RNA sequence: CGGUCCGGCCGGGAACUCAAAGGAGACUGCCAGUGAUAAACUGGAGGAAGGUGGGGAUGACGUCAAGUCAUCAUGGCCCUUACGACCAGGGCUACACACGUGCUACAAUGGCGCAUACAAAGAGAAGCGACCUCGCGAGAGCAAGCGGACCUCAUAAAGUGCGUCGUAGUCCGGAUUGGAGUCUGCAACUCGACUCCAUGAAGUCGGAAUCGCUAGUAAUCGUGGAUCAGAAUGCCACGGUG
């Protein structure tokens, strides 16, 4: 099987991108498992906001990495060329591995 | 100082970002650095033309710059010459193969950056600041926005004491998190000092 | 035959499977007295079967994860009451009087900024 | 508060006897949140005190607390140039709190070996109408009996 | 009674009375009783002179009171006559190993002297 | 403290200057900014002018200083007293 | 900060990535368990002969836009004030105000 | 259900905890009374939660010539073979004193030793570093797994069971000082952290006064992250008993 692990910053965009990859892979191949979600990595930061002196004045920010996993169990000869041909959306990183 | 950045409080819900891509924990800072280099370069070069926004977008080891401007004539000029002359040097700055998309904005007296640079350039060429503010305010109202609040601040053309003027009209709620509040600020360099301009423009509430 | 109930507490998630039996209260592959080292915690386990007269009438099969001693025990109580309302369905008024079905909506409060804990400020002084 | 009229707080009874009064007493004894050690102290103390006195822990603790319940208490009013200390008829749930608080404060001020023995000796004295808790109740009640004139 | 020339308490436990010597603490006392075979549950009372002989041999194997006070006095004296930084700090009477002295050096400065 | 597996620490120029001055055998002050260098027994009997920040304070090396780095004999701050 | 300080940190990055090889060489020859002892002495001495500014432990983490030394954030490369200004203008992706 | 090396561990299985995404839900909805037929309140049957469910984010016009020209930007003035640079060493860590904020305690609701159980949040490539061998230990050597619901940091502690201790300057407290060291690092003397052995100061609950907190709060116990070669009793977070 080839496992597909898609990391992104926006849940709407990652849902649309995994939707387009699951329909393009479904059209050619067979036995796509499912777009499962995994734990969202919530990186967090704390900034003092005064330029000189206030310890009691702070903002806190998050980068909420959303992360999905889509499995392809029965690849044909050409679905791997289909996905290496498929330019994916601007702002979604993908990792694919057989095994 | 009290208030919040009215773009930053709506970066999630209604307003989109200005630099959308992904990185690991390894190339995040270098993405930020090359992004800031091409931002400062593009602003400094096409500051004569009126840029409004820059969407930096790097899909899969190539960069893409979407320049929302209002006057494309000083951005382009002749038959696609200066745009490629800029595109090869954006590739030179970022180090990556590149693309430049250039988009227009309709009604160039409605976005937040353009009105701010209008008041800025008028204050550099030394007009009355009240005429500049009231001109921009009534221009946006007859252009049909729901609200505008402009505010100039500091060393207002012949003072030693620095007061802060603001005009509002229409309605422009800031504590609403579902409004569409185009906010931007700018700085005018006069020999009286640095005169600061801020402008809020409310376009319309957006539903879920 | 079996019945299901999910109980939840501070950070404890409990799975309860109720059957008619003879008294075997077995929790996470070890006995009740070998699991909970507090008669208050065993009391919070066996409270709704003290309200009803089903102490030794019905056995179960319980797993639990997360939380602490009392958090786990309260999750056990919540799952057992959910399963009893699945079982006889008529003790809804009785469990509303007992105050057991009411999912305890308290949580550890988040430490705010500038404050040493959730609500304690440091030593303010005029000078 | 000023606006809220807040009612009481439900506390679960003990697994030993079902006594809400003993639940309040183990709560008032417990400090730093460790409920288990105070549970062990109050269970040991009621066990040995019932073993001495004969009868049950519930009745023994209740009558030795009833011998140290206050009847009327004292609180400031100030309105002149000196402080009036007026008497007030206590509330029928607050007198329990005062009784158990004075008992555990006398138990902490006692000089015994272990706190189980401290509570045992103090509540046996509070059954025999003697001890620091009994003398504290009698002197608060006698100060209220002195200042009976400010029942305005 | 006597161990390394200095008495130890009698009613107390073995290692707790063996910690009462200048030079053997809890770890060295536990090692002494390990080498002696007397476990650490006995008192100094009900101990016989053969066991005290074993303890005396094993305790005199270490460096205990008098030699240890010669060691420490000679080491501090060595620093002081050498005139290094730690020697200068010892003869001033301040904390040596790098503490702060704007406040909180009171173990070496004693009490707080008034200025009047 | 310095790790035993690395041996001691003495930098190149003080080691070379010490070895040249002990191969010759003169008594002049060896001016030296290297405050951090462990004293060797081949430095015994010499005057080392250790820089203390302000001046070149001299130490006459004996046999007792066999492990101590040179700035122990050279107090950087100056404290007379507060009275 | 001062432009001398920014160029000084560029000097430090230059010398560090220049001598990344010899430092790992001589620190292997220092830290190894079975080694020729005068070779270990030579490794320590040559490690001193290397320039002091070629340690990776000597370069302070400046800001990447203004060179402010205190208040770095490694996942952004910028100082705290400039990262607040950039995060509120919107030049950093996925960076909203963490409400929890 | 199977097969069980007895360890979710391998065929599995979609029920469950769980992980997100989309939703439904709580609004005076219903009832009674007060209320001016109103706004509303006092209640209560339903409901997981009853009136803002809880917590955060959001800080109106402006006040204090508040703070920062040392994040940055900048009018003017001042320096220009120097107030600009570069390097070594020192200082920012001093100390007759005084204050603020914290931590450790003054112990028996406790200390010590031996077993025993229950988490949440995170962080990792010049990095996290298992297993195994050596060292009492801090750690050393070998070194797979890992950009990670996969592996590592990592054992949670208070708690529970037993023993002991006997109200003492104690088997409390742990300061300070000597010796021996490991790591990081060109380099631990000024000036790091940590370990071991020894040493065991003051302190026996605190005057005048003052502070925090209304419920998972106070109090108490652990764990992580940022910064970071090494260096937190702080800061920012998470749970546990309560
Ligand atoms: Mg704010
Ligand atoms: Mg907490
Ligand atoms: Mg603070
Ligand atoms: Mg203050
Ligand atoms: Mg004060
Ligand atoms: Mg000793
Ligand atoms: Mg500059
Ligand atoms: Mg550094
Ligand atoms: Mg109801
Ligand atoms: Mg109700
Ligand atoms: Mg609001
Ligand atoms: Mg002022
Ligand atoms: Mg320097
Ligand atoms: Mg400082
Ligand atoms: Mg071992
Ligand atoms: Mg014990
Ligand atoms: Mg005492
Ligand atoms: Mg001790
Ligand atoms: Mg010791
Ligand atoms: Mg004393
Ligand atoms: Mg409140
Ligand atoms: Mg870390
Ligand atoms: Mg660190």
Curated annotation (Swiss-Prot), chain A:
Q: Which GO terms describe its biological process?
A: cytoplasmic translation; regulation of DNA-templated transcription elongation; ribosome biogenesis; transcription antitermination
Q: Does the keyword Transcription apply?
A: yes
Name of the featured protein:
Small ribosomal subunit protein uS10
What the protein does comes down to: Involved in the binding of tRNA to the ribosomes. Part of the processive rRNA transcription and antitermination complex (rrnTAC). The complex forms an RNA-chaperone ring around the RNA exit tunnel of RNA polymerase (RNAP). It supports rapid transcription and antitermination of rRNA operons, cotranscriptional rRNA folding, and annealing of distal rRNA regions to allow correct ribosome biogenesis. In complex with NusB is involved in the regulation of ribosomal RNA (rRNA) biosynthesis by transcriptional antitermination.
One GO CC annotation: transcription elongation factor complex
NCBIfam families per the UniProt record, alphabetical: PRK00596.1, rpsJ_bact
- Gene3D superfamilies (alphabetical): Ribosomal protein S10 domain
Give the organism the record lists.
Answer: Escherichia coli (strain K12)
According to the lineage, what is the superkingdom?
A: Bacteria
Q: Which UniProt keywords apply?
A: Ribonucleoprotein, Ribosomal protein, Ribosome biogenesis, RNA-binding, Transcription, Transcription antitermination, Transcription regulation
Q: Name one GO molecular function term.
A: transcription antitermination factor activity, RNA binding
Disulphide linkage map: none
Q: Which family does it belong to?
A: Belongs to the universal ribosomal protein uS10 family.
UniProtKB/Swiss-Prot annotation, chain E:
Annotated region (Disordered), positions in chain: 93-116
GO cellular component terms listed in the entry, alphabetical order: cytoplasm; cytosol; cytosolic small ribosomal subunit; small ribosomal subunit
Q: What keywords is this UniProt entry annotated with?
A: Ribonucleoprotein, Ribosomal protein, RNA-binding, rRNA-binding, tRNA-binding
- Is rRNA-binding a UniProt keyword of this protein? yes
InterPro entries under this entry?
Rbsml_uS13_C, Ribosomal_uS13, Ribosomal_uS13-like_H2TH, Ribosomal_uS13_bac-type, Ribosomal_uS13_CS
Q: What does the entry give for GO biological process? A: cytoplasmic translation
Pfam families registered for this protein in UniProt: Ribosomal_S13 (PF00416)
The protein's GO terms of the molecular function aspect are: rRNA binding; structural constituent of ribosome; tRNA binding
- What superkingdom heads the lineage? Bacteria
Question: Known PROSITE patterns for this protein?
Answer: RIBOSOMAL_S13_1, RIBOSOMAL_S13_2
Homology family: Belongs to the universal ribosomal protein uS13 family.
Instruction: State how it assembles.
Output: Part of the 30S ribosomal subunit. Forms a loose heterodimer with protein S19. Cross-links to the P site tRNA and weakly to the A site tRNA. Forms two bridges to the 50S subunit in the 70S ribosome, contacting the 16S rRNA and proteins S19 and L5.
Q: Which PANTHER family match?
A: 30S RIBOSOMAL PROTEIN S13/40S RIBOSOMAL PROTEIN S18 (PTHR10871), SMALL RIBOSOMAL SUBUNIT PROTEIN US13M (PTHR10871:SF1)
Q: What is this protein called?
A: Small ribosomal subunit protein uS13
Q: Which organism is it from?
A: Escherichia coli (strain K12)
Curated annotation (Swiss-Prot), chain F:
Q: Which Pfam families match?
A: Ribosomal_S19
Q: Which GO terms describe its molecular function?
A: rRNA binding; structural constituent of ribosome; tRNA binding
GO CC list: cytoplasm; cytosol; cytosolic small ribosomal subunit
Q: Does the keyword Cell membrane apply?
A: no
Coiled-coil boundaries:
none
Q: Which SUPFAM superfamilies match?
A: Ribosomal protein S19
Q: Which GO terms are recorded in the biological process aspect for this UniProt protein?
A: cytoplasmic translation; ribosomal small subunit assembly
What are the record keywords, sorted? Ribonucleoprotein, Ribosomal protein, RNA-binding, rRNA-binding, tRNA-binding
Q: Which residues form the signal peptide?
A: none
Write down the InterPro entries for this protein, in alphabetical order. Ribosomal_uS19, Ribosomal_uS19_bac-type, Ribosomal_uS19_CS, Ribosomal_uS19_SF
Homology family: Belongs to the universal ribosomal protein uS19 family.
UniProt subunit comment: Part of the 30S ribosomal subunit. Binds S13 and L5 and cross-links to the A site tRNA.
Role description: In the E.coli 70S ribosome in the initiation state it has been modeled to contact the 23S rRNA of the 50S subunit forming part of bridge B1a; this bridge is broken in the model with bound EF-G. The 23S rRNA contact site in bridge B1a is modeled to differ in different ribosomal states, contacting alternately S13 or S19. In the 3.5 angstroms resolved ribosome structures the contacts between L5, S13 and S19 bridge B1b are different, confirming the dynamic nature of this interaction. Bridge B1a is not visible in the crystallized ribosomes due to 23S rRNA disorder. Protein S19 forms a complex with S13 that binds strongly to the 16S ribosomal RNA. Contacts the A site tRNA.
Q: What protein does this entry describe?
A: Small ribosomal subunit protein uS19
UniProt gene name: rpsS
Curated annotation (Swiss-Prot), chain G:
Oligomer and partners = Part of the 30S ribosomal subunit. Contacts proteins S3 and S10.
Which terms in the Gene Ontology molecular function aspect does this entry carry? rRNA binding; structural constituent of ribosome; tRNA binding
Among Pfam families, the record links this protein to: Ribosomal_S14
**What's the family?**
Belongs to the universal ribosomal protein uS14 family.
Q: Gene3D superfamilies from the entry?
A: 1.10.287.1480
* Highest taxon listed in the record's lineage: Bacteria
Which PROSITE patterns does the UniProt entry name for this protein?
RIBOSOMAL_S14
Q: What is this protein called?
A: Small ribosomal subunit protein uS14
Q: Which keywords does UniProt give here? A: Ribonucleoprotein, Ribosomal protein
Q: Which GO terms describe its cellular component?
A: cytoplasm; cytosolic small ribosomal subunit; small ribosomal subunit
UniProt record, GO biological process: cytoplasmic translation; ribosomal small subunit assembly; translation
Source species: Escherichia coli (strain K12)
This chain's function reads:
Binds 16S rRNA, required for the assembly of 30S particles and may also be responsible for determining the conformation of the 16S rRNA at the A site.
């Amino acid at each position: 099987r080839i496992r597909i692990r898609l990391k992104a910053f926006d849940h709407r965009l990652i849902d649309q991108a995994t939707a387009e990859i699951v329909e393009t892979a479904k059209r050619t191949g067979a036995q796509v498992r499912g777009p499962i979600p995994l734990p969202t990595r919530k990186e967090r930061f704390t900034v003092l906001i005064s330029p000189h002196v206030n310890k009691d004045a702070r903002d806190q920010y998050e980068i909420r990495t959303h992360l999905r996993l889509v499995d392809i169990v029965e690849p044909t000869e050409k679905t791997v060329d289909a996905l290496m041909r498929l330019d994916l959306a601007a702002g979604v990183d993908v990792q694919i591995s057989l095994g | 100082g009290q208030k919040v950045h009215p773009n930053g409080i709506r970066l999630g819900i209604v307003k989109p970002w200005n630099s959308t891509w992904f990185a690991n924990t390894k190339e995040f800072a270098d993405n930020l650095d090359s992004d800031f280099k091409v931002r400062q370069y593009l602003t400094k070069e096409l500051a004569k033309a009126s840029v409004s926004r820059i969407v930096i977008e790097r899909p899969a080891k190539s960069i893409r710059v979407t320049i929302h401007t209002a006057r494309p004539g000083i951005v382009i000029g002749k038959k696609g010459e200066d745009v490629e002359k800029l595109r090869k040097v954006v590739a030179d700055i970022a180090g990556v193969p590149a693309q430049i998309n250039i988009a227009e904005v309709r009604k160039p007296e409605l976005d937040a950056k353009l009105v701010a640079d209008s008041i800025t350039s008028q204050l550099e060429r030394r007009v009355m600041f009240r005429r500049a503010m009231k001109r921009a305010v009534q221009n946006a109202m007859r252009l049909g926005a729901k609200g505008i609040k402009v505010e100039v601040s500091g060393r207002l053309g012949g003072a030693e004491i620095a007061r802060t003027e603001w005009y509002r009209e229409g309605r422009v709620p800031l504590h609403t998190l579902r409004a569409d509040i185009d906010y931007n600020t700018s700085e005018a360099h006069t020999t009286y000092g640095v005169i600061g301009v801020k402008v809020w423009i409310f376009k319309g509430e957006i539903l879920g | 035959n079996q019945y299901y109930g999910t109980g939840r507490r501070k950070s404890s998630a409990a799975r309860v499977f109720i059957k008619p039996g003879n008294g075997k209260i077995v929790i996470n592959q070890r006995s009740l007295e070998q699991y909970f080292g507090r008669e208050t915690a065993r009391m919070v386990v066996r409270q709704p079967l003290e309200l009803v007269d089903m102490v030794e009438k019905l056995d179960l099969y319980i797993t639990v994860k997360g939380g602490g001693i009392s958090g786990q025990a309260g999750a056990i109580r919540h799952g057992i009451t959910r399963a009893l309302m699945e079982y006889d369905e008529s003790l809804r008024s009785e469990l509303r009087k007992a105050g057991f079905v009411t999912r305890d909506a308290r949580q550890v409060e988040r430490k705010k900024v500038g404050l040493r804990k959730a609500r304690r400020r440091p030593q303010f002084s005029k000078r | 508060p000023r606006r809220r009229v807040i009612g009481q707080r439900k506390i679960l009874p003990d697994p030993k006897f079902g006594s809400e009064l003993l639940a309040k007493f183990v709560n008032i004894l417990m400090v730093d949140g460790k409920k288990s050690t105070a549970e062990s102290i109050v269970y040991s103390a009621l066990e040995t005190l019932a073993q001495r006195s004969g009868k049950s822990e519930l009745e023994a603790f209740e009558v030795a607390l009833e011998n140290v319940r206050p009847t009327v208490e004292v609180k400031s009013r100030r309105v002149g140039g000196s402080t009036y200390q007026v008497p007030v008829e206590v509330r029928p749930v607050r007198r329990n709190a005062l009784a158990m608080r004075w008992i555990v404060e006398a138990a902490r001020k006692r000089g015994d070996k272990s706190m189980a023995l401290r509570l045992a000796n103090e509540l046996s004295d509070a059954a025999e109408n003697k001890g620091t808790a009994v003398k504290k109740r009698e002197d608060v009640h006698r100060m209220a009996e002195a200042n009976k004139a400010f029942a305005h | 009674a006597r161990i390394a020339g200095i008495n130890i308490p009698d009613h107390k436990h073995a290692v707790i009375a063996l910690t009462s010597i200048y030079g053997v603490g809890k770890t060295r006392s536990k090692a002494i009783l390990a080498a002696a075979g007397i476990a650490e549950d006995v008192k100094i009372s009900e101990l016989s002179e053969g066991q005290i002989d074993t303890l005396r041999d094993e305790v005199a194997k270490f460096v205990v009171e008098g030699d240890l006070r010669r060691e420490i006095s000679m080491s501090i004296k060595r620093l002081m006559d050498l005139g290094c930084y730690r020697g200068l700090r010892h003869r001033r009477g301040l904390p040596v190993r790098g503490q702060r002295t704007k406040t909180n050096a009171r173990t070496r400065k004693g009490p707080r002297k008034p200025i009047k | 403290p310095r790790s035993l597996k690395k041996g001691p620490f003495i930098d190149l120029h003080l080691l070379k200057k010490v070895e040249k001055a002990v191969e010759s055998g003169d008594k002049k002050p060896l001016r030296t900014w290297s405050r951090r260098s462990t004293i060797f027994p081949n430095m015994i009997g010499l005057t080392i002018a250790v820089h203390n920040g302000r001046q070149h304070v001299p130490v006459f090396v004996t046999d007792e200083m066999v492990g101590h780095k040179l700035g122990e004999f050279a107090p950087t701050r100056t404290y007379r007293g507060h009275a | 900060a001062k432009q001398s300080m920014k160029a000084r940190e560029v000097k430090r990055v230059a010398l560090a990535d220049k001598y990344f090889a010899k430092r790992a060489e001589l620190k292997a020859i220092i830290s190894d368990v079975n080694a020729s002892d005068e070779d270990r002495w030579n490794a320590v001495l040559k490690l001193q002969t290397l320039p002091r500014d070629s340690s990776p432990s000597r370069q302070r983490n400046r800001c990447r836009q203004t060179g402010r030394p205190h208040g770095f954030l490694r996942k952004f490369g910028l100082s705290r004030i400039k990262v607040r200004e950039a995060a509120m203008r919107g030049e950093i992706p996925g960076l909203k105000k963490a409400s929890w």
